[PDB]
Amino acid sequence: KPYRDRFPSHARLPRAGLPRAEILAEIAAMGAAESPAWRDGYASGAVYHGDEHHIAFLNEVYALQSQSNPLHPDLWPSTAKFEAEVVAMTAHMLGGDAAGGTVCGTVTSGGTESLLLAMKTYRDWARATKGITAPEAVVPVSAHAAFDKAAQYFGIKLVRTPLDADYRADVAAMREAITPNTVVVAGSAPGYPHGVVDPIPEIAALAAEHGIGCHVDACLGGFILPWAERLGYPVPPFDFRLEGVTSVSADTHKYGYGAKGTSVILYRRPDLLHYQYFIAADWPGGLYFSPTFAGSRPGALSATAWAAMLSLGEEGYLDATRRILQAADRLKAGVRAIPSLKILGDPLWVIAVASDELNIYQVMEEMAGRGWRLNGLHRPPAFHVALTLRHTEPGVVDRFLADLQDAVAQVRAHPEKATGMAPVYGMAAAAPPELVRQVLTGFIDLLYEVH
Amino acid sequence: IKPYRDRFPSHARLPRAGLPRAEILAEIAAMGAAESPAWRDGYASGAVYHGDEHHIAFLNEVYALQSQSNPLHPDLWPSTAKFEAEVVAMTAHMLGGDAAGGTVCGTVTSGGTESLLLAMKTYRDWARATKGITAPEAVVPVSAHAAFDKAAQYFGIKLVRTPLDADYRADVAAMREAITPNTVVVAGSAPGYPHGVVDPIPEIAALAAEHGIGCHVDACLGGFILPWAERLGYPVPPFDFRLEGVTSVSADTHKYGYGAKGTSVILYRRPDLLHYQYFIAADWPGGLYFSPTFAGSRPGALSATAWAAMLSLGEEGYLDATRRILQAADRLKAGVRAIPSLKILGDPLWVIAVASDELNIYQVMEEMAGRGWRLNGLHRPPAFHVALTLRHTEPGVVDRFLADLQDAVAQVRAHPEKATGMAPVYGMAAAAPPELVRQVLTGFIDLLYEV
Ligand code: NA
Numbered sequence: 054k055p056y057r058d059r060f061p062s063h064a065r066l067p068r069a070g071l072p073r074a075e076i077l078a079e080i081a082a083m084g085a086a087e088s089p090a091w092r093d094g095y096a097s098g099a100v101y102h103g104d105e106h107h108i109a110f111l112n113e114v115y116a117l118q119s120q121s122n123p124l125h126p127d128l129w130p131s132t133a134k135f136e137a138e139v140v141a142m143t144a145h146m147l148g149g150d151a152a153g154g155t156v157c158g159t160v161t162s163g164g165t166e167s168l169l170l171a172m173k174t175y176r177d178w179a180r181a182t183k184g185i186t187a188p189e190a191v192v193p194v195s196a197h198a199a200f201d202k203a204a205q206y207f208g209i210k211l212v213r214t215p216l217d218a219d220y221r222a223d224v225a226a227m228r229e230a231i232t233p234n235t236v237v238v239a240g241s242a243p244g245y246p247h248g249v250v251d252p253i254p255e256i257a258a259l260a261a262e263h264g265i266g267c268h269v270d271a272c273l274g275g276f277i278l279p280w281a282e283r284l285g286y287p288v289p290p291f292d293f294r295l296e297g298v299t300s301v302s303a304d305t306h307k308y309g310y311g312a313k314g315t316s317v318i319l320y321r322r323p324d325l326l327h328y329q330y331f332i333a334a335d336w337p338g339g340l341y342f343s344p345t346f347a348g349s350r351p352g353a354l355s356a357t358a359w360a361a362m363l364s365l366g367e368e369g370y371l372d373a374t375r376r377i378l379q380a381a382d383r384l385k386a387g388v389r390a391i392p393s394l395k396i397l398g399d400p401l402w403v404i405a406v407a408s409d410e411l412n413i414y415q416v417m418e419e420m421a422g423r424g425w426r427l428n429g430l431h432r433p434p435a436f437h438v439a440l441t442l443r444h445t446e447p448g449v450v451d452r453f454l455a456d457l458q459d460a461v462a463q464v465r466a467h468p469e470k471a472t473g474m475a476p477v478y479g480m481a482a483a484a485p486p487e488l489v490r491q492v493l494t495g496f497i498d499l500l501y502e503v504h
Numbered sequence: 505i506k507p508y509r510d511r512f513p514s515h516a517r518l519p520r521a522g523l524p525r526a527e528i529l530a531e532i533a534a535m536g537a538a539e540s541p542a543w544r545d546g547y548a549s550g551a552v553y554h555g556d557e558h559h560i561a562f563l564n565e566v567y568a569l570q571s572q573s574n575p576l577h578p579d580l581w582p583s584t585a586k587f588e589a590e591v592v593a594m595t596a597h598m599l600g601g602d603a604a605g606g607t608v609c610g611t612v613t614s615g616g617t618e619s620l621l622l623a624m625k626t627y628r629d630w631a632r633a634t635k636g637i638t639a640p641e642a643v644v645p646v647s648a649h650a651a652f653d654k655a656a657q658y659f660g661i662k663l664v665r666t667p668l669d670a671d672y673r674a675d676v677a678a679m680r681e682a683i684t685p686n687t688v689v690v691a692g693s694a695p696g697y698p699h700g701v702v703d704p705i706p707e708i709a710a711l712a713a714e715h716g717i718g719c720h721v722d723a724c725l726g727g728f729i730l731p732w733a734e735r736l737g738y739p740v741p742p743f744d745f746r747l748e749g750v751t752s753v754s755a756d757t758h759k760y761g762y763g764a765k766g767t768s769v770i771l772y773r774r775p776d777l778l779h780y781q782y783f784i785a786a787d788w789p790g791g792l793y794f795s796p797t798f799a800g801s802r803p804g805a806l807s808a809t810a811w812a813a814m815l816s817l818g819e820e821g822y823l824d825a826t827r828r829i830l831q832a833a834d835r836l837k838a839g840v841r842a843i844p845s846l847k848i849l850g851d852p853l854w855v856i857a858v859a860s861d862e863l864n865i866y867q868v869m870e871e872m873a874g875r876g877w878r879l880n881g882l883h884r885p886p887a888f889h890v891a892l893t894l895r896h897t898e899p900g901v902v903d904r905f906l907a908d909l910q911d912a913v914a915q916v917r918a919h920p921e922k923a924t925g926m927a928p929v930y931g932m933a934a935a936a937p938p939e940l941v942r943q944v945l946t947g948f949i950d951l952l953y954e955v
Binding site: 054055056060062063064065066067068069070071072073076077080081083084086087088090091096099100103106108110111112113114115116117118119120121122125126127128129130131133134136137138140141142145146157158159162163164165166169173194195197198199201202205206207208244245246247306312313314323327330331332333334335336337338339340341342343344346347348349350351352353354356360362363364365366367368369370426428429430431432433478481484486489490493494496497498500501502503 | 505506507508512514515516517518519520521522523524525528529532533535536538539540542543548551552555560562563564565566567568569570571572573574577578579580581582583585586588589590592593594597598609610611614615616617618621625646647649650651653654657658659660696697698699758764765766775779782783784785786787788789790791792793794795796798799800801802803804805806808811812814815816817818819820821822878880881882883884885930933936938941942945946948949950952953954955
């Protein structure tokens, strides 16, 4: 709570309205304080484009569409066109034409919502068409935490399966975990922890053999992998090119470079998509439907997804991806050169680094002391850096490597040193899950404290 | 209908080369010039709640300043964590939170629907953990939002809908009779969407408390009006945390809070309830992970607009806006009651459902549509409503409505069998079997997404 001193806190409505100009000044001052961290490339992920002109462009898209609520297609036909076109272009980018032109889907609020919708959809589809009432889903331990959210929300038993030596899903273990109640298996393309792409072709084949769904979580890779493939990088098919793939999520607000608050969920056929829709026919409020979880939605954010995709085009995504993967190549070579560190698996641009000899959490804390905001991992202990366009700016990768070399030297010199956040991550890694839940619950409460 | 089919190019695939930003903006701007008059000039029921150009420009600048905000990372955007904390605190205080003894707490959500879903899930989880209930039920009036059915279907809750009395308010005897040992929550609306009437919250809350179950007040529509209507001397029963048995309340900042679309608030009487809402993952290799609500990544700029709107209005601003809306409603209601063949359903303050026992109300509505009005068509029983906003408090707007409504009724009286445009559509939807409605609406959503 860094502003507790500098700015008044508001626990109650002001009696009189406060001047707009004063309100904007506070927000602008906070922006000046907060933006350097992501602008200058210190943040893993978080901001995916970050360019001044791109941002000013999407801000004006927002301004022009600010009143849009896609719950009312009759008032905002513009926004329904934008969502239809985002879905179509994304589907085409992800091998939709290979499905025979039946690929369809919706815009969502984010990768989490795309995953939740897909999970609910397989649940309802399986109940209706296979008589399954105690649904199960099989995913690798690396699959996003949102799969557990979906499981707990929709009453699906989540079975998480082990990874091989390369941190990719062990498909044999996935086959073993399938039962008559399994409704879907998933693979990540790539997974968030270690940036590796699961063996999608085998997972898709597994699913098809069992007549169950196969969801590919391409939230992180959907706007990168197709371009990496065209640039010559090693990437096997991960999308609708695979016969057994029945849905794919992809985040326009990650490497699509749209504004935060949008993603896409795609299904192989409409008969599947139809299980996602909510329709109420008996309500005194009249006919009511929604394609996704929300009722009212900020249509302006859909406009920003559409605008971003159109302003980039294939050549734009190709260039962005090129820059990111070149930076990644350079970063990975540097990490491999530093003694006592290793990279987990063989990632293209989301790089998890670990150490068998040193406390990786203190190496991470040493980086944080130099301004870096990296993601702390566990199982196993590691940190990761998800490279973005912010990291392709001049000097950024070199600063990272220089800082990391220094971090490692400092930790080797005092291997028992543990400061700042390092003991927090270490304790969290060792702690019983229930204890973690209690403490993190207290933490969320603290974020909401007004003093 | 898709108005831009022949006016602008359609995009089924990414352009090969990025298109100029300036052209993309021109196209979006052109669509805005086409679309804004309808809401700006007061023709839309609900839809746009403030709509003033200076207010809008103000929020658009709030968005610009916070555009990169993603509250999944409070360490990068402490500004936004502060905004959400203060939106919750101010809203809680406005809704009688101090009467709870200072234990009232909550979170910002993406909208009214998410607030309702979250409350529903929360009572389900709470009841499972503390009451051993594994086949949860919820009892709500038939007028309660369609979103209650979404929550029931998502989270495996049996939803029991109960009849209204002659004033279109919840029949509390029927709710009592519907309670079983598996019931986890009862709800009332403040006010309900269809007819704008406030349920007997005190009786419902007392019912709930007597049974040791939750009581959720859906104040999504009324939360930012009712407290001020009450201060102004209008007849409004207590409906909030002043009532002992009220355990949660939802209120929409993006409705009469005058924030931008994409925000709402869910409040709980105590932290031990709120804690059942949080998602926490402790064994994920992606590290410690938590979400206070459904989403992971979120558009923090939208929370900023809620906060800024609340601050720029203050109590005086909400009091003034509410006064204007309620006096416009008073005038509008009197004018409708003065028209021989029309009646208003129940006794609403500002969301007015109008019906007719003698004429086809759907054609009356169609005659209004031919004059530019975008009203909401209801059924059970047939009616239309107008949810009055600041847009309808502008000079001449209520007078135009009544003048148009008088001509509408004169025309229908002259040709009682006339049924044109959307009138036969609403008429058929009201008579049609729900399964048939489901199939047709499913086809309609498909139509929205056609490129
Ligand atoms: Na190394």
